[PDB]
Amino acid sequence: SVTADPSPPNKLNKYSSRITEPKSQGGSQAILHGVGLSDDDLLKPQIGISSVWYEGNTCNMHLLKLSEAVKEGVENAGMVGFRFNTIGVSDAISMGTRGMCFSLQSRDLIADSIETVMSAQWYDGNISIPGCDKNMPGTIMAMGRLNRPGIMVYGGTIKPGGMYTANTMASAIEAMGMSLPYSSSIPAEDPLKLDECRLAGKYLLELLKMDLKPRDIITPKSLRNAMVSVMALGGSTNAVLHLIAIARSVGLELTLDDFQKVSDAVPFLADLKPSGKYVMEDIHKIGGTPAVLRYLLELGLMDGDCMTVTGQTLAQNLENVPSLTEGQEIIRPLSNPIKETGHIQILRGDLAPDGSVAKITGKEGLYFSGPALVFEGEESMLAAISADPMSFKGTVVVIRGEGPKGGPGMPEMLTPTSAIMGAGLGKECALLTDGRFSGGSHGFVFGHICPEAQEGGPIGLIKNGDIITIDIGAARIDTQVSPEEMNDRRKKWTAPAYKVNRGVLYKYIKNVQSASDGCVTDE
Template sequence: MPEDKKKFRSASWFGRTDKDGFLHRSWMRNQGFPDDVFDGRPVIGICNTWSELTPCNAHLRALAERVKRGVWEAGGLPLEFPVMSTGETNMRPTAMLFRNLVSMDVEESIRANPIDGVVLMCGCDKTTPSLIMGAASCDVPAIVVSGGPMLNGKFRGRDIGSGTDVWRFSEDLKTGKMTQLEFTEAESCMHRSAGHCMTMGTASTMGSMAESLGLALPFNSTIPAVDSRRSVLAHLAGRRIVEMVKEDLRISKILKKEAFENAIRVNGVIGGSTNAVIHLLAFAGRVGIPLTLDDWDRLGRDVPTLIDLMPSGRFLMEDFYYAGGLPAAIRALGEHDLLHKDALTVNGKTIWENCKEAPNWNREVIRDFENPLVAHGGVAVLRGSLAPDGAVLKPSAASPHLMRHRGPAVVFETIEHYHERILDPDLVVDENSILVLKNCGPKGYPGMAEVGNMGLPPKLLERGITDIVRISDARMSGTAYGTVVLHVCPEAAVGGPLALVEEGDMIELDVEARRLHLDVPAEELERRRASWKPSLPTMKGGYQQLYVEHVMQASEGADLDFLVGCRGATVTRESH
C-alpha cells in the first residue's frame, strides 16, 4: 500500500496483511468488489435516512446512487449504510424525541466501521440535525446532501404550501369557509412530488443552516428534489468528499464560532424556523463551541427578513431557487457587513467566495434590504419571571399588533387538556386572552412536540380573529405561524414558573423589550409551588426513560447530557 494512503482510517481494517485484514477484505468481496478497491483508496460512508415511512426522504435511495458515482470517479470506495429515519409526518409521540437517538446511531456507525469520510443523506426536519450531530461527535470529514424541497403545491389556481396551508384550511373547515370535500381534495394537491416541505419550515431551514454553516455545497438547500440539478449536486458531493478526506478537512475545521454566527444571521434573513435554535445549540455542544440563546438574540435582532416565503410570506422554495437560492441571500448579508466572509466551507472555498457574485433574479422573492418583509427578523429571545432561562418567538411569523400585549391566561395542563377544552363553546376566551400550554417540553411530553401553535377556539375564528398570543414549553412546526412564544425554560415538568400559571393570571409580553412577565406576587407563586407535584411520563425502561433522565433543557439544545462533546473516531482496538 502506498505510504500516502496508509494515513486513511480504513487502512487499519483493509490495509493489514494478517488474519484480520484477510477477514475484513474477504467478507467485503462477497459483494463483488474487485481486488483494487482495497488498495488504500478512501472509504466513504454514505449515511442514508431513506425510508418509506419518511415520505420526505423516500427518494434518497436513488439520490445516493448519484453520490456513489462521484465517489467512484474521484477514486474512493462508497459504502452505503442505513440509520434510523425520523419522519415528522408519521412518528409518535414526536420525531424530536428520537433526534438524539439517531445521532447516537450515526456516531457509533461511523466509529465502529472503516469509514474515512461520510456523506450525510438527509431532508426531513430531524434527519439533518441528527446526522450532523453524530458526525460532529466523530469529527470526520463530512458533507451534507439534502433531498431537497418538493415542487410547489397547486390547488384551485393558486400555490399552496405544505404545513402552512393545512393550518389555514383546518381553521376554515371549523368555521364553514371550506367544505370537507374541498379539504380532502387539497390533500393530493399539496404534496405532489418527492421532497420535503417546500415552505420555509424546519426541513428547508435546516438545509439552509447546513449550507450557511459551510457543511454543504452551494444551492444544496434550495434545488427542488425532482430537478435534475439535485442529482448533479449529489454527484459533485460524492467527488468532493473524497478530496476532503485527502485534505483532512474535518467538521471541526468548518464549525467555528464564525460559522455559527453566519448561520444565525442567515436564519434571520430567510425567516427560518425556531427549531433551528435548538439544533444549532446542540451542534455547538458537540464541537465545543460556546453558543447561547443570547447569541441568537444579539446576532439576529437587527437582521431583516428578506425572503418572502411561507409561512412568513407568499412564495415557496421552488421560487426561492429560481430567484437565486441561498447564495443570493448570503450575498445580501455580506454586502451589509453581516457575514464572516472568511468562514471555510466543504468545497474548500470561503463562504464569500461561493456567494459574492450570486445573482438575484427576482426581487419580490429575495427582497432588498431597503424593502424587507420584516425589518427585524431573526429570533427574539424573551426573558422574565415566566421564562428566567429564556423563551423564543419568531417575529416574521407574528402579528405586529400583538408584539406588545397584556392579557389573562387560559391554561391547559397538557395537550390532552387543551383538546378537551378548546372546542367548548363555554370556554371563557377572547382576543385579549393568552393561551398557555404546560408539560410539553423536553421531559414533559417527552420529546418537546410541535404543539405550541395551538389552534384558536372556533368561537374566535367565527368572529374573524385569526391570531392571539400563545405560550408554551413546546416547539412549533417551522411551517406554522402566529404570535407564539415557545421553548419556555425551565419547562413546566421540572417546576419552571410555567408550571405555576393559573387560569386568569395576567401575563405581559413585550417583544421589543424582550420581556415575558407573569404578573403574580412572589409570595403567591411560593404558595403554589409548595403544592405543585411533577407529572413526568410514566414509561419505564427503554430509550424514553433514558431520554427523560438525561435530556437537557431547550436553552441548552435539548441534547442528552452524556452526548455533549466530541469523542473522535478512534476505535479502542483494531482487531477481534
C-alpha cells in the same frame, strides 16, 4: 474537549487503514473482500454513505436513488462507497397525535446511528443524504462528533403541486459551509440534484486531501453565518434547538442570547411562506441559496473567510455565482426589509427565567395581558376550546407539560393555533408552552419556555386567573403573582409521574437537556 469516537492509527485512508493494512486484522480484510473489495480497493479511502430513506414520507421515499448516485460518484473519484441507512419519521403523518412525541428525539437517534456505523466500520469520510423531513441536523451532529471529513447532500424540497424546519435547516447548513452550493435550493428529483449527488465524491476526495474536517468548517463564525441566513430568510424557531445542538457537537458554545444578538443585527428580507408569499422553488429560479448568500455577504452581514466543503471559503464560492435575478421581488433590499430585525425573539421574565422563543413579525403590537387559562396538555386545551370557545377570549392560554421530559419528547403542536384562528380568537389571546408550536405560528405565541413544567419551572406553577403580562419590548413574560407567592407554590409542588417508564422515550427523559440547551442528550 470532545471525546466520543476512535482516533486514527498524509494518507487519504487515515481511518480505514486501521483494518485494511496490519495483518492482525485479516478477519476485517476477509469480510471486505467478501463484500466485493479487491486488493487494490483495500488501499482506497472508504466513504460511509448514510441516507435517511423510508417509504412512509414523500420527502424520503426517493433517497435510495440519490444514495446510488452518491456511491457511483464516490467510485468515479477513486474511493470505495459503503451505503447504509437510518430511520426518520414524518411530522405531517404524526402531527396531532402522540406519535409526535417521537419526532424531535429522532434527530438525536440519527446522530447516534451514524456515529455508530462510522466508528465501528472505520470509514474515512461521510456523505449524508437527509430528506426534506426534519431530522437532518442529526447528520451534522454525527459529523461533528466524529470530526471526519463529511458533506451533507440535502435531498431537496418537493416542488409545489416554505421556510419551515427542513428548508430552514438545509439553507442554514449550506450557509454554515457543510453542504455544497445550491444543495438547499435545488428541488428534490431535479436533474441537478442527481448531478450534485454524483459530484459529492469528487469534493470529498479533496477534503480528505486537505484533511478539511467538520470542526475546521463549523466554527463560531460559520455558526453565525448559519444564524444570519435563518434571520434573513425568516426561518423556523426550531433552528434555535438544532443550531445549538450542532454547535455542541463540535465542542463550541451557542446560547439563546447569541440568537438574539444576530436577530437584532439582521433584517428579515425574504418574502417566503409561511410569513410571505413564495417558496423554495421560487428561490431556485432567481439564483438559489448562493445568490441569497451572495447578497447577504455583499451587505456585510456574513463572514466570507469561513472554509466550506468545496475546499474553498464562502466568499470564494459566492464570488462567481449568478446574483439574484434582476427585478426579483422575493428578497427585499436592505432599505425596505419586511422587518428591520429578525423574527426570532428570545424572552425571559418571571415565567420563562431560562428563556423562551417566539416568532415576532413586528405587526402584532408590543403588549398582551390577560388572566391565565391553564391546560396540562394539548388534549384538554382542544376540548375546552371546542366546548366553550368564548372562555378563551382575552386570556393567556398555557399548554404545559409538553417539554422535553413532560411531553415527553417536546412535541410540536399545530391544532391549538388552528382552533384559536377558527374560533375567531387570533388577536384576542396569547399562547405559552414548554413545548413547541408549528411553523404557521407567530405573534403572541411563545414556546420552549424553560424550565419546563415537568422540572418545576414557573410555568408549572401558574394557576387559572393569574394575570400574565407579555412585554415584547422588554422581552419578558411576567406574572402579577408576587415572587414570594410563586415561591410558596414551588415549595408545595411535586413533579408529576413520567408518562413512560420504558423504551426510547424513557431514555430521552433520562438524557435530554432543556430546550434552552438545544435538547442535547449526550452530555
